[PDB]
Coordinates of C-alpha atoms and ligand atoms in Angstrom, one line a residue:
X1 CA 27.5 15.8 -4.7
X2 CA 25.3 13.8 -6.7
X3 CA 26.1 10.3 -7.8
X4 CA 26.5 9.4 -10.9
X5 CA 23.7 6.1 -10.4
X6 CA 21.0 9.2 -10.1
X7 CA 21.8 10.9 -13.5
X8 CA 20.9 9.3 -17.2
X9 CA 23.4 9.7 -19.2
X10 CA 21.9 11.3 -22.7
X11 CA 20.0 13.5 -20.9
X12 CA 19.4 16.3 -18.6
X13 CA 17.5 14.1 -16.3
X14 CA 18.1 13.0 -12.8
X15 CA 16.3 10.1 -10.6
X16 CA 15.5 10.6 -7.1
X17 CA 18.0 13.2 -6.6
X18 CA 16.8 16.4 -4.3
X19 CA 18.9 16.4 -1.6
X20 CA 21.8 17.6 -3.7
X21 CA 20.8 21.8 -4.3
X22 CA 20.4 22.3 -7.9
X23 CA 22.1 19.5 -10.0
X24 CA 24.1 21.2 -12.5
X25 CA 22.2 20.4 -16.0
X26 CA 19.2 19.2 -14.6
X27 CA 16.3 20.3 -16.7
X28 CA 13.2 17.3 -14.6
X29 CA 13.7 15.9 -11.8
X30 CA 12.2 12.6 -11.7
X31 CA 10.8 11.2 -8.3
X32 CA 10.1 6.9 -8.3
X33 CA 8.0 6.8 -5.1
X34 CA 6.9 9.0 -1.9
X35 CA 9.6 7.2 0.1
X36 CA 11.7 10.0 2.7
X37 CA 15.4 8.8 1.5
X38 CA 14.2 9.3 -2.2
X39 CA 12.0 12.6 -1.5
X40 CA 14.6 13.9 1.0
X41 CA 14.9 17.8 -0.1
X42 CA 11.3 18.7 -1.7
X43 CA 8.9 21.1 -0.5
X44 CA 7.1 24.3 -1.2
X45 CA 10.0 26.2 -1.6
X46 CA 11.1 23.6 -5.0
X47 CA 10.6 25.0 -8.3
X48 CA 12.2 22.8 -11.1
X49 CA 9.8 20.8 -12.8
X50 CA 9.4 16.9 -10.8
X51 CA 7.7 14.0 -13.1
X52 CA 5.9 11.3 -11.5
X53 CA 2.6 9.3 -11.1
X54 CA -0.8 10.8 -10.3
X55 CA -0.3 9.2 -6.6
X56 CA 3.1 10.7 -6.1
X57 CA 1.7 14.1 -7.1
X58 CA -1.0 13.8 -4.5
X59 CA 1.2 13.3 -2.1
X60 CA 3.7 15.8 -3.3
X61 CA 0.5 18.8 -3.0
X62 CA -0.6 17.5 0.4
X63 CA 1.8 16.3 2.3
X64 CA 5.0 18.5 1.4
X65 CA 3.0 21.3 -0.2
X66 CA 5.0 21.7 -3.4
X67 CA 3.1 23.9 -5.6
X68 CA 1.0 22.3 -8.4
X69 CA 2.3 24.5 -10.7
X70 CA 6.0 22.4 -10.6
X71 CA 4.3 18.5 -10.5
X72 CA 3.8 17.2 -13.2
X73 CA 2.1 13.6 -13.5
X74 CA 2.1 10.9 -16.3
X75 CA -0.5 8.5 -16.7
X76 CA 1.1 4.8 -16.4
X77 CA 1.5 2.2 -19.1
X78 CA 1.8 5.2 -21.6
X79 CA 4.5 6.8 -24.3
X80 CA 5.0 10.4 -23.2
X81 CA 7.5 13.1 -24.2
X82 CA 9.2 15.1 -21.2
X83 CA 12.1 17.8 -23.1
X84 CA 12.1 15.8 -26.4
X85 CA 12.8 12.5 -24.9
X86 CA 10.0 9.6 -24.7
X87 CA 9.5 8.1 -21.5
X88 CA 6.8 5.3 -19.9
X89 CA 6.2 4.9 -16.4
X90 CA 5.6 1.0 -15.7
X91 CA 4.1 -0.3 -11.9
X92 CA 7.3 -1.0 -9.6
X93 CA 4.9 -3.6 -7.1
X94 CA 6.2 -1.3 -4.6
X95 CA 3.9 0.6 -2.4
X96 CA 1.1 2.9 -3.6
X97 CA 2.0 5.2 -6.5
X98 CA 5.9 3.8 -7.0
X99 CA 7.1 3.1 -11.0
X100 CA 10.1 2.2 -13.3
X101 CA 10.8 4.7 -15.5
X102 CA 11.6 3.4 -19.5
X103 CA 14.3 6.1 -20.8
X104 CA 13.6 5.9 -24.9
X105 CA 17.4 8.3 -25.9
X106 CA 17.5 10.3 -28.7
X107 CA 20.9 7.9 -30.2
X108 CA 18.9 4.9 -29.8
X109 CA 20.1 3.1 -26.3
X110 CA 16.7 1.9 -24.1
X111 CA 17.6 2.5 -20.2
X112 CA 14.8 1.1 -17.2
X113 CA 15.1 2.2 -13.8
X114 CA 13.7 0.3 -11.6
X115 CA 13.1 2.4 -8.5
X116 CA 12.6 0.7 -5.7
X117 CA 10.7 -2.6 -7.3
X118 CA 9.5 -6.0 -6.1
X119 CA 9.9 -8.4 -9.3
X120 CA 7.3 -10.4 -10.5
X121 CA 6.7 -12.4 -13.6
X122 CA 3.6 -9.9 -14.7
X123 CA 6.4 -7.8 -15.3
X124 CA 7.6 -10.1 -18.6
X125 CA 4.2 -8.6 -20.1
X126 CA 4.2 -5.1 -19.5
X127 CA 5.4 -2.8 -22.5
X128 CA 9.3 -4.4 -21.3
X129 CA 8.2 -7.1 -23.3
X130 CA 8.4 -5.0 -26.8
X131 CA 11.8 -3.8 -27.2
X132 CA 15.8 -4.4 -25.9
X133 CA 16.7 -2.8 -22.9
X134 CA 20.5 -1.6 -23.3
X135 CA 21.3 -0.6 -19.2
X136 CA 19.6 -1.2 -16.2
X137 CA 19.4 0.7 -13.0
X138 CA 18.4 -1.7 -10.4
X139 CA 17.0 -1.9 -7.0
X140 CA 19.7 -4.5 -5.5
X141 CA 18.4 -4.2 -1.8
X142 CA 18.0 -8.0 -1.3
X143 CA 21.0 -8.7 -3.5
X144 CA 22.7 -11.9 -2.2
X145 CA 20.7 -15.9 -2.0
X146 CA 20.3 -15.7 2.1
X147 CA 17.1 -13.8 0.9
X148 CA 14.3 -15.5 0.8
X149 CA 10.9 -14.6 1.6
X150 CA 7.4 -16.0 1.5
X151 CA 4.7 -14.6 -1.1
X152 CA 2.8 -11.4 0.4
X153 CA -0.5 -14.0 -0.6
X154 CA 0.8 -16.3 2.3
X155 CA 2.1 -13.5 4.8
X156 CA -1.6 -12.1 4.5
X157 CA -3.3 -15.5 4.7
X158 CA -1.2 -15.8 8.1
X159 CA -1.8 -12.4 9.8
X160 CA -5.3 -12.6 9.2
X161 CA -6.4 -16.2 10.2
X162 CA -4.0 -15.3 13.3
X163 CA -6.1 -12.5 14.3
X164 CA -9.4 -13.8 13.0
X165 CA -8.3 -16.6 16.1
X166 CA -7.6 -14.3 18.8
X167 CA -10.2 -12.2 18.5
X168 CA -13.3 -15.1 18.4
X169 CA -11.3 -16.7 21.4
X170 CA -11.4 -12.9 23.4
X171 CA -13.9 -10.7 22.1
X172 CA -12.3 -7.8 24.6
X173 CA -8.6 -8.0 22.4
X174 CA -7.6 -5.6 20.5
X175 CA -4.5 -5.6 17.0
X176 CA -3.0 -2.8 16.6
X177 CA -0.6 -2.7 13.8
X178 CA 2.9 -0.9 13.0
X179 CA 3.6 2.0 10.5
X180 CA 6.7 4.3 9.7
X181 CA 6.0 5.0 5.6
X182 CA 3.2 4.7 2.6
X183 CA 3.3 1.0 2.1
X184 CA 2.2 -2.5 3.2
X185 CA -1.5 -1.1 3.8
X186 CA -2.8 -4.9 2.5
X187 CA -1.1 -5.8 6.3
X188 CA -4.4 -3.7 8.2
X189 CA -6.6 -3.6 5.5
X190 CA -7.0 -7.3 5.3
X191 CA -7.2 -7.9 9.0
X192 CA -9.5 -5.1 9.9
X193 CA -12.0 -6.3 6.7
X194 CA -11.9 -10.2 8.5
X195 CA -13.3 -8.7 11.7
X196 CA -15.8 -6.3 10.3
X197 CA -13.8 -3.1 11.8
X198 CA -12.7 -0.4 10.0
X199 CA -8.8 0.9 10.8
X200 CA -8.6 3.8 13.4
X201 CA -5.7 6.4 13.1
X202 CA -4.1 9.7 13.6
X203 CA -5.5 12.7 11.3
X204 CA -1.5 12.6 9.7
X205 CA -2.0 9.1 9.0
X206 CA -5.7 9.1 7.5
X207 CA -5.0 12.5 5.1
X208 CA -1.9 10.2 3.8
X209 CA -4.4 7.2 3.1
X210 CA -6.7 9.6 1.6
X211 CA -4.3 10.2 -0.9
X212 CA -3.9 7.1 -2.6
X213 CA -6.9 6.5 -5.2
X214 CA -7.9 3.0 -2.9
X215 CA -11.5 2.1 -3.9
X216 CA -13.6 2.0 -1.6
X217 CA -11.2 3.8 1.0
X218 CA -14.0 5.9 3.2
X219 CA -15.2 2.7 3.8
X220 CA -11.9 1.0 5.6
X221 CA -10.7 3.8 7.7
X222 CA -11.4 6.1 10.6
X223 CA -10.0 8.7 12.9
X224 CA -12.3 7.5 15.8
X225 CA -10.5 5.0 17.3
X226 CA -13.1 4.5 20.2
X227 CA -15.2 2.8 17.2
X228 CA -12.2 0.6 15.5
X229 CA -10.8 -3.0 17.1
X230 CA -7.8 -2.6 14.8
X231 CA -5.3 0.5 15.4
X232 CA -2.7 1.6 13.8
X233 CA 0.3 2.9 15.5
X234 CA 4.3 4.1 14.8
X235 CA 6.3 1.2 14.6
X236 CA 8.4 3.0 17.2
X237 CA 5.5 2.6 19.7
X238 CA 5.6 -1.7 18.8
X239 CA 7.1 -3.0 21.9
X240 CA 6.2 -3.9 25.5
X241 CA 6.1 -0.6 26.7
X242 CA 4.3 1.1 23.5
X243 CA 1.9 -1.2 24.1
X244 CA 1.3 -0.7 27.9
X245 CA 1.1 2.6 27.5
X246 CA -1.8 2.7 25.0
X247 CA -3.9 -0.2 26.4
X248 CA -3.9 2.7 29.2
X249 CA -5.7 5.0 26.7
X250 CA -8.1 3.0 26.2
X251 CA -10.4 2.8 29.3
X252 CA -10.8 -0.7 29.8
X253 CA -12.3 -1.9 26.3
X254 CA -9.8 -4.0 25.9
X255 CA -7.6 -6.3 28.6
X256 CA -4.9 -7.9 25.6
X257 CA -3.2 -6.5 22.8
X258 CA -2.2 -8.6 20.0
X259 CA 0.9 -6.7 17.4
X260 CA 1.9 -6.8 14.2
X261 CA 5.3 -5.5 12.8
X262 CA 6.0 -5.6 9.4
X263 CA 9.2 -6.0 8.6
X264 CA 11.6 -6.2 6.0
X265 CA 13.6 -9.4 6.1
X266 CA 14.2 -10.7 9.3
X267 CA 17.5 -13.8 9.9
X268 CA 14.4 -16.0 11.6
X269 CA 14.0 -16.6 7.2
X270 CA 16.9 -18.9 6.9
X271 CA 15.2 -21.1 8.9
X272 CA 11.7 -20.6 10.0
X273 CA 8.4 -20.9 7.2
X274 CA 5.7 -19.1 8.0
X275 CA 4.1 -21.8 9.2
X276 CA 6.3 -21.6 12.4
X277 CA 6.4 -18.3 13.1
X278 CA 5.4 -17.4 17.1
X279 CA 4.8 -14.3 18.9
X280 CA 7.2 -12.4 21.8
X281 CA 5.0 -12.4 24.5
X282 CA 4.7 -10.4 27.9
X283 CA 2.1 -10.9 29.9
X284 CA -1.5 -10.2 27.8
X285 CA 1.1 -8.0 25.0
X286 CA 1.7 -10.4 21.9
X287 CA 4.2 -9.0 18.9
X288 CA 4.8 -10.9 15.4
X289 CA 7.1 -9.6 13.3
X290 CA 6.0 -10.8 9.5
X291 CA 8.2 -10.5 6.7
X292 CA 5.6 -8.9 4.3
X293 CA 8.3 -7.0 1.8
X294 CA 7.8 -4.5 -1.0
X295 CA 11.7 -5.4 -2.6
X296 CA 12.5 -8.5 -4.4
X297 CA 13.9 -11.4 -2.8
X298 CA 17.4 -12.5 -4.3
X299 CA 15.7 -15.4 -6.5
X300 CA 12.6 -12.8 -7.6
X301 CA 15.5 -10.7 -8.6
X302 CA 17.7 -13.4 -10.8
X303 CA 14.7 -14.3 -13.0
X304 CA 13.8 -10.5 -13.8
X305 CA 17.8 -9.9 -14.8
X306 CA 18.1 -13.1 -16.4
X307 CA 14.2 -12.4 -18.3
X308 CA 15.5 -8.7 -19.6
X309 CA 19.0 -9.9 -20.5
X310 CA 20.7 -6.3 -20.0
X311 CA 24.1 -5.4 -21.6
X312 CA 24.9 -3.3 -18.5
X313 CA 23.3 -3.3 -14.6
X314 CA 24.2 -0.4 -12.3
X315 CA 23.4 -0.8 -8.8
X316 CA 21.2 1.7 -6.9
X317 CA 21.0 0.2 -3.5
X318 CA 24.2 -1.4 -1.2
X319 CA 26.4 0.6 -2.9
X320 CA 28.5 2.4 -0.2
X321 CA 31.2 -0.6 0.5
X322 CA 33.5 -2.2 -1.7
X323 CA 33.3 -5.8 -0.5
X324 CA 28.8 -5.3 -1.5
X325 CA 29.6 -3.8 -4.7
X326 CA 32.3 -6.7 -5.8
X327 CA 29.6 -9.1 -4.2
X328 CA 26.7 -7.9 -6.3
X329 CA 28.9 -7.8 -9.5
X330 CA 30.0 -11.4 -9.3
X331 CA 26.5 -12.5 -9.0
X332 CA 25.4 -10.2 -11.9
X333 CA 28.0 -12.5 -13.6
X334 CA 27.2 -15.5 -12.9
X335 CA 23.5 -14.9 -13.5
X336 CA 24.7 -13.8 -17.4
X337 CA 27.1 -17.0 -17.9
X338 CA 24.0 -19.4 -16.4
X339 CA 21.6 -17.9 -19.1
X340 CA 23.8 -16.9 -22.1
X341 CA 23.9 -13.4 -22.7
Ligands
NI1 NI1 11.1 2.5 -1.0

């Protein structure tokens, strides 16, 4: 059944929440970002009305095929009435398309939910900045201090100064890159723009890039990988063998592969900067896993929380065990004796 984290209370609204049949009450069905475990259950079959951003909705239409006559988008940064209740949608720094949603109820309480979100100080200037926000429902993915990560500025100053090095050194070398989701596109786009190639995908890949409103976008990518130096592949085909396999397909254009797999967070963090980071290597087959993420590390997280001051957090990530939610709440304390709310 659906958990109670997915439903605001006030309302006949629900957040991320299709898997579930038809949520008794639900009148919209609000959807954060075009991420599978939050759009698990739509396609062209749905028809309840779903709120979300313009990007969202091109997705939704192309890539699921829900009818247009059920999406309905909101321009962000904007006060819009949805069933008699006003609502904003605010940039989550998530990937392309993802928000918070600002939950204005009738009685007066002010709820934010934060998707999936990677804090930032910007944030503290946004329309957040103008009123008191009552409950929070927050993305607590990174939740405990073991999380640290670099900024995505110094991940992409890495990856591409890495490969702008191979490549001069071997002109025949290709860099393929790792994807699974929408998201992280700064990764290829940044590389492929340092060596004057554009990026060279599947046709299921490119139609999902040619959803997202990038400028400039025609420019950047390709389905004719025979003219691109930097492809992109399923992160289930980065590894030794993967790679083998299509160095094959390429008819000897290339003789050394150099991989990139974004990752979440990765235990190497404790200790290594980026700095440090090195390659697993067999033979000419090179991988670096980077820890370019799109949540908020645990210190990112404290200075939003301790910024909006809420009277009431609720969890939307790590929730299943009892030893991560007692965990999470005794940092949510400490964070509100530290500052005083
Ligand atoms: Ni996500």
């Amino acid at each position: 059944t659906c958990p109670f984290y997915k439903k605001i209370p006030g309302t006949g609204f629900t957040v991320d929440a299709f898997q579930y049949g038809v949520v008794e009450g639900c009148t919209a069905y609000f959807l954060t970002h075009f991420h599978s475990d939050h759009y698990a259950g739509l396609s062209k079959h749905f028809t309840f009305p779903v709120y979300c951003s313009e990007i969202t909705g091109n997705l939704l239409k192309n890539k699921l095929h829900v009818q247009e006559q059920y999406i309905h988008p909101l321009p962000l940064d904007t006060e819009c009435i949805v069933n008699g209740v006003k609502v904003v949608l605010l940039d989550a720094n998530h990937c392309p398309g993802a928000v918070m949603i600002l939950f204005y109820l009738p009685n007066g309480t002010v709820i934010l939910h934060t998707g999936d979100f990677r804090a930032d100080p910007s944030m503290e200037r946004s329309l957040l900045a103008d009123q008191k926000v009552h409950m929070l429902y927050l993305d607590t993915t990174y939740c405990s201090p073991e999380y640290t990560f670099p900024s995505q500025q110094e991940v992409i100053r890495f990856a591409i100064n890495t490969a702008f090095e191979a490549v001069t050194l071997n002109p025949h070398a290709l860099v393929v890159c790792g994807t699974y989701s929408i998201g992280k596109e700064k990764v290829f786009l940044a590389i492929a723009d340092v060596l004057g190639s554009k990026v060279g995908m599947s046709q299921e890949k490119y139609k999902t890039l040619q959803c997202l409103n990038i400028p400039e976008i025609n420019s950047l990518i390709t389905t004719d990988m025979c003219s691109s130096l930097v492809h992109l592949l399923p992160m289930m085909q980065i590894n030794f063998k993967g790679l083998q396999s299509h160095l094959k397909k390429c008819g000897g254009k290339y003789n050394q592969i150099l991989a990139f797999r974004p990752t979440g967070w990765t235990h190497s963090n404790k200790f290594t900067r980026i700095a440090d980071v090195i390659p697993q290597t067999k033979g000419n087959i090179s991988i670096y896993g980077i820890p370019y993420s799109e949540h908020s590390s645990y210190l990112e997280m404290k200075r939003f929380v301790q910024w909006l001051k809420p009277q009431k957090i609720i969890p939307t990530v790590n929730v299943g065990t009892w030893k991560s939610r007692s965990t999470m709440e005794k940092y949510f304390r400490e964070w509100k004796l530290e500052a005083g709310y």
